[PDB]
Amino acid sequence: MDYKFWYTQPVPKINDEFNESVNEPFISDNKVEDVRKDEYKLPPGYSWYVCDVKDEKDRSEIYTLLTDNYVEDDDNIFRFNYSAEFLLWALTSPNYLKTWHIGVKYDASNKLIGFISAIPTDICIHKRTIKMAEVNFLCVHKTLRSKRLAPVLIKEITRRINLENIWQAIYTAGVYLPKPVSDARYYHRSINVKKLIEIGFSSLNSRLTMSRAIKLYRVEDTLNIKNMRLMKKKDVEGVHKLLGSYLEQFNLYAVFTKEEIAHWFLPIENVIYTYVNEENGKIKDMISFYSLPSQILGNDKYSTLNAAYSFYNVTTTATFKQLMQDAILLAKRNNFDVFNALEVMQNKSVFEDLKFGEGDGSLKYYLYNWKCASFAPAHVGIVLL
Ligand SMILES: CCCCCCCCCCCCCC(=O)CSCCNC(=O)CCNC(=O)[C@H](O)C(C)(C)COP(=O)(O)OP(=O)(O)OC[C@H]1O[C@@H](n2cnc3c(N)ncnc32)[C@H](O)[C@@H]1OP(=O)(O)O
Ligand SMILES: COc1cccc(CC(=N)NC(=O)c2ccccc2OC2CCNCC2)c1
Ligand SMILES: [Cl-]
Ligand SMILES: [Mg+2]
Numbered sequence: 001m002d003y004k005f006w007y008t009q010p011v012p013k014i015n016d017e018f019n020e021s022v023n024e025p026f027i028s029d030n031k032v033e034d035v036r037k038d039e040y041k042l043p044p045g046y047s048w049y050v051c052d053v054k055d056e057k058d059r060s061e062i063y064t065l066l067t068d069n070y071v072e073d074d075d076n077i078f079r080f081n082y083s084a085e086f087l088l089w090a091l092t093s094p095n096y097l098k099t100w101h102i103g104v105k106y107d108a109s110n111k112l113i114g115f116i117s118a119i120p121t122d123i124c125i126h127k128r129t130i131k132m133a134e135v136n137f138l139c140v141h142k143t144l145r146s147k148r149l150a151p152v153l154i155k156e157i158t159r160r161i162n163l164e165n166i167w168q169a170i171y172t173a174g175v176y177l178p179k180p181v182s183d184a185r186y187y188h189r190s191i192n193v194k195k196l197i198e199i200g201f202s203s204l205n206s207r208l209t210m211s212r213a214i215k216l217y218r219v220e221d222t223l224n225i226k227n228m229r230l231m232k233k234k235d236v237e238g239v240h241k242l243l244g245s246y247l248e249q250f251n252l253y254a255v256f257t258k259e260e261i262a263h264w265f266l267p268i269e270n271v272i273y274t275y276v277n278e279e280n281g282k283i284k285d286m287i288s289f290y291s292l293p294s295q296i297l298g299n300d301k302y303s304t305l306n307a308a309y310s311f312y313n314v315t316t317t318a319t320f321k322q323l324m325q326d327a328i329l330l331a332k333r334n335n336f337d338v339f340n341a342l343e344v345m346q347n348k349s350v351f352e353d354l355k356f357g358e359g360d361g362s363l364k365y366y367l368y369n370w371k372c373a374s375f376a377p378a379h380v381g382i383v384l385l
Helices: 056-069 084-091 150-162 193-198 210-217 233-247 258-265 320-333
Strands: 046-050 078-080 101-106 111-125 128-140 169-173 182-190 252-254 272-279 282-291 294-296 307-310 338-342 357-368
Touching (some): 056 084, 056 101, 056 111, 084 111, 084 128, 101 150, 111 150, 193 210, 233 272, 272 320, 282 320, 307 320
Parallel strands (some): 128 169
Antiparallel strands (some): 046 101, 078 294, 169 357, 282 307
């Protein structure tokens, strides 16, 4: 593996390893003045297109592109299916720029064939808070793959981010690239055991018959934290303090403003669910997860896998095991087939006791133009969508 594009970028080489005492950009003293003002060149017959994610039809174009062409599991049985409403929520956070929502259309058909996006946030890395772009939803149409279009998207968004005097980015991928700061396996907790078997997500054996697997995964419809309820506006100050205080321990975390806590946590049906425990006017516990269905490719019975992805979970009145058991319950009450989590923060500590299964791969975390020590994923305290 040669990394002919990645080698030219301010990111570590495959073999670089830095001490905890290094925590700085690869390239500093950057000047907005010097950034190229011209758009990167596309191949003949393709054009940059500014996507207006707040316009239903533009948002729908992105939706269709990703639905057809976005990330599949290692075996090509599932494809991520972010909803249009999810996209809206994901891309219009506080201080977002419409111009970091970058499509490429094929001129002859006026069809969107490429996409990349970023939103700005404060990122704390080894106790240094830096303004960064959070990049996501890079996608080239399946019929246009391995044509070196992705580097053009990446260079173009880097240029536009740099124009705002931002010089660092954070991103995740399942692929290995120069060079992860941390690497987090994913795990799955079955809710609807029978569906998961029928679609090949999960497995049975002579010792685990269907009826026993169903019994293994059954959950009691009663919360450990009795008063856990959907978050409301009035809980924003309390979540900001609970979640903020919690995150300061990790090597890698977003430093949320109150405005960002409202945007990121206030519940939206089929998008984001946040539950809180309020005691004496204080928010003492919180659970949150987001909805990311997967399209099931060619299963005769089921087209969609409804899945909850653990976002941020904090307890002060219960055990973390108890809190995450409540999170599984709340996901079941909301019709999800499965609860997914990565081995970040304290999550790994509860996976065995709560009957999570190890998945088949891992999610790599990346920083652009930042040089530091890598670390085990328990020290990661940010979950990207
Ligand atoms: C200061 C601001 C900085 C901002 C920018 C920050 C950086 C953000 C960077 C992006 C973060 C996005 C995070 C995110 O969205 C979440 S990760 C999931 C990304 N999307 C998908 O996997 C969807 C399915 N695949 C596709 O649409 C295509 O396969 C893509 C578009 C992935 C590559 O299209 P292609 O037709 O398969 O390939 P070529 O055009 O020929 O290009 C090949 C080159 O691209 C490198 N490549 C492959 N996958 C990559 C990936 N996931 N990140 C970065 N680079 C990736 C690859 O190593 C090679 O470079 P090399 O030759 O050096 O190896
Ligand atoms: C079940 O259907 C699919 C479809 C496509 C790919 C995969 C495997 C996967 N790569 N999972 C995660 O990345 C993952 C697992 C647990 C928690 C978070 C995960 O990734 C999130 C979604 C994509 N971007 C980063 C967060 C499964
Ligand atoms: Cl209850
Ligand atoms: Mg390409």
